[PDB]
């Protein structure tokens, strides 16, 4: 659902409606 | 009334919030350009600036523990701090205290690097 | 891996997008909300109506000419009031001579008439809004005994309304317009109100950001 | 564009107006000096559909007689006359609240509304080309129906009637539906709003092929209310202030003669 993150029209701050926790998911997947 | 332009300003001053209105009485259009409940008050701006003095750019847990910016969003803190220095990346200023930014003028005047949107590109 | 780079570049493009939008925002960008509007954001059950009354008599010297109401009926959406809570508002003190417009659903027609007569109004009219599709046909909704294809706004009047600041037989009592987003209302009800009362004081309760207009005092929660 | 071929499709569709029924077991006629001031329980009982074909003498109407609203409370509607029946009454903008309060005092719960949106005959005639009698009006309406593909480029908002009223301009006619309980309906089979092109003199006086639509709507509200001869013995539908010459089968027509 990578393209579903921006499928809906959110406000310019909410456009990271799922990237918020990806900001740490990337870190944890880099750890292992 | 007869002169509505002053009437609306007075009603905003005496009934509306300080976020919705302004000191003179004009609409805060920046408030209405964003979703309700997600607004960056200048109080949040000065709170973040004081937090830079407290700990500076780095991890954002203790900056949201004292909650200088009340009930703030962590990624919003790590994003709005970029506009303080004018650089799209903060790897050069991690875990350090800054008194005066000193970076806006030098990074804004860099003709060699990108000057778009009052910033400096990677 | 590759998805890491893709998410990084997506995040980047959004980052410069947000930076550009915020740079224009903190440079004098105009919003869709008109100037010359009075957006009170508060709770109607807790609002100090005396403060609003004093402000209205201080800045205008007289009360509202038209009061539009869109009550959140306790039929079942998520932030609704009760019938007695809506009845308890000091509407009697917010208006002396003028009209009241109440958008009444079918389930709340009788109680709407009862509240209108309780506040001291004479039920004199009601405007029907008929819902149109994209093509131009009639929109069909759920029905109780008949397929509901319209919605009614009851209009009561009180006091001396023949001051010359209102007009007779201004326009049709039918509004044939397309169905916009949920719970929204057509924009030409405001045009009909302006035809009824040109350059007057108007008050809207339970208003939203969509309903903000010129010469308009709008009170709301999400507003 | 206009979609008037679909808005007025019923006006030409297979909905033929019904012919008057003779005085026989399929109908019933009653002649009374006054309807409101008379006992209606002896003419029929256990009704489940009572249509009051009332033409009110409101101030908007230009002094052409009619009933008086204050006399509606005088009407006696005993529980023996109907136990659980839907009451249809022709409303006016002046007396909607009074009618609602009177039906509440009598024990009826307001449930539904029905509206007719009125288009101008003269407006359609002018769009197509560029004291009338019933026959002339009917033939003009047939002509307007025939040339339905010519004015389809117009805007519907330019065709509505604009009748005088001290507050707004009249464009619809209203039929109120009240309920009383102490019926096996078919529910959403007819739209809540209908479109009709009419003359600008007496839009309140619903004419034939428009009253026929109302009759069919009322009759399809209650499919179990059909009066099949032989199996039944009493009529369960009544109309007051009916027409002296047009007797609808299966109805009790009461004439204020
Ligand atoms: N005290 C209160 N309780 C519940 N809703 C309230 C309220 N005061 C104001 N409201 C407003 O009433 C709205 C629902 S009424 C229906 C939506 C809106 N009024 C409209 O038709 O345009 C909510 O959005 C809320 O903002």
From TrEMBL, chain A:
According to the lineage, what is the superkingdom?
Eukaryota
Could you tell me what this protein is called? Answer: Myb-like domain-containing protein
From TrEMBL, chain B:
Superkingdom to which the source organism belongs: Eukaryota
What this protein is called in its record is Transmembrane protein, putative
Q: Which organism is it from?
A: Tetrahymena thermophila (strain SB210)
Q: Which residues of the full protein are shown?
A: 164 to 285 of 295
UniProtKB/TrEMBL annotation, chain C:
Enzyme Commission number, as recorded: 2.1.1.348
What residues form the membrane-spanning segments? none
Q: Which domain of life is it from?
A: Eukaryota
Q: List residues binding S-adenosyl-L-homocysteine 1.
A: 43-44, 185, 210-211, 221
Which amino acid positions bind S-adenosyl-L-methionine 1, per UniProt? 43-44, 221-222
Among the GO biological process terms of this entry, one is: methylation
Enzyme class, spelled out: transferase
**What's the protein called, per UniProt?**
mRNA m(6)A methyltransferase
Part of the intact protein present: 196 to 428 of 428
TrEMBL record, chain D:
Question: Per its record, how is this protein called by name?
Answer: Uncharacterized protein
Q: Which organism is it from?
A: Tetrahymena thermophila (strain SB210)
Region of the whole protein represented: 98 to 432 of 455
């Amino acid at each position: 659902t990578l393209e579903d993150i921006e499928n809906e029209k959110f406000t310019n701050l909410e456009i990271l409606t799922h990237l918020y926790n990806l900001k740490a998911e990337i870190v944890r997947r880099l750890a292992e | 009334p007869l002169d509505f332009t002053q009437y609306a300003k007075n009603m905003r001053k005496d009934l509306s919030n300080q976020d919705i209105c302004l000191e003179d009485g004009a609409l805060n259009h920046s408030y209405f350009l964003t979703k309700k409940g997600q607004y960056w008050t200048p109080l949040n701006q000065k709170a973040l600036q004081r937090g830079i003095e407290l700990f500076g750019v780095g991890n954002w847990k203790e900056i949201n523990y004292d909650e200088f910016s009340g009930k703030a969003n962590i990624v919003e803190l790590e994003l709005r701090t970029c506009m303080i220095l004018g650089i799209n990346d903060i790897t050069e200023y991690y875990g350090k205290k800054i008194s005066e930014e000193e970076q806006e003028e030098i990074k804004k005047s860099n003709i060699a690097k990108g000057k778009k949107e009052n910033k400096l590109k990677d | 891996q590759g998805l890491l780079q893709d998410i990084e570049k997506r995040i980047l493009h959004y980052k410069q997008l947000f930076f550009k939008e915020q740079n224009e925002i903190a440079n004098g960008k105009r919003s869709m909300v008109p100037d010359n509007s009075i957006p009170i954001c508060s709770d109607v059950t807790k609002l100090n109506f005396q403060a609003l009354i004093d402000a209205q008599m201080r800045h205008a010297g007289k009360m509202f000419d038209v009061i539009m109401m869109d009550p959140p009926w306790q039929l079942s959406a998520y932030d609704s009031l009760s019938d007695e809570k809506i009845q308890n508002m000091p509407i009697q003190s917010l208006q002396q001579d003028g009209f009241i417009f109440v958008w009444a659903i079918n389930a709340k027609y009788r109680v709407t008439i009862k509240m209108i007569e309780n506040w001291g109004y004479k039920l004199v009219d009601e405007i029907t809004w008929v819902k149109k599709t994209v093509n131009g046909k009639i929109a069909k909704g759920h029905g109780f005994y008949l397929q509901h294809a319209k919605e009614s706004c009851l209009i009561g009047v009180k006091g001396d309304v023949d001051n010359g600041r209102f007009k007779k037989n201004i326009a049709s009592d039918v509004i044939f317009s397309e169905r916009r987003g949920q719970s929204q209302k057509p924009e030409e009800i405001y045009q009909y109100i302006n035809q009824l009362c040109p350059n007057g004081n108007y008050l809207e309760i339970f208003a939203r950001r969509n309903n903000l207009h010129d010469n308009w005092v709008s009170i709301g929660n999400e507003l | 564009d206009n979609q008037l071929s679909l808005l007025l499709k019923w006006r030409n569709d297979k909905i033929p107006l019904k012919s008057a029924s003779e005085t026989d077991n399929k109908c019933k006629v009653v002649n009374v000096k006054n309807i409101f001031k008379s006992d209606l329980s002896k003419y029929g009982a256990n009704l489940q559909a009572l249509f009051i074909n009332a033409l009110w003498k409101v101030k908007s109407r230009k002094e052409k007689e009619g009933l008086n609203i204050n006399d509606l409370s005088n009407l006696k509607i005993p529980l023996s006359l109907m136990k659980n029946g839907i009451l249809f009454i022709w409303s006016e903008k002046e007396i909607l609240g009074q009618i609602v309060e009177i039906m509440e005092q009598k024990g009826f719960t307001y449930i539904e509304n029905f509206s007719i949106m009125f288009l101008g005959l003269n407006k359609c005639l002018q769009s197509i080309n560029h004291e009338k009698s019933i026959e002339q009006v009917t033939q003009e309406k047939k002509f307007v129906m025939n040339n339905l593909d010519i004015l389809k480029s117009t805007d519907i908002n330019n065709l509505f009637l604009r009748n005088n009223y001290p507050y707004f301009k009249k464009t619809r006619h209203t039929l109120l539906m009240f309920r009383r309980i102490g019926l096996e309906l078919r529910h959403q089979r007819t739209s809540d709003v209908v479109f009709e092109v009419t003359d600008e003199q007496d839009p309140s006086k619903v004419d034939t092929m428009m009253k026929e639509y109302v009759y069919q709507m009322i009759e399809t509200l209650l499919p179990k209310a059909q009066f099949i001869p032989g199996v039944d013995k009493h009529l369960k539908m009544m109309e007051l202030f009916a027409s002296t010459d047009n007797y609808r089968p299966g109805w009790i027509s009461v004439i204020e003669k």
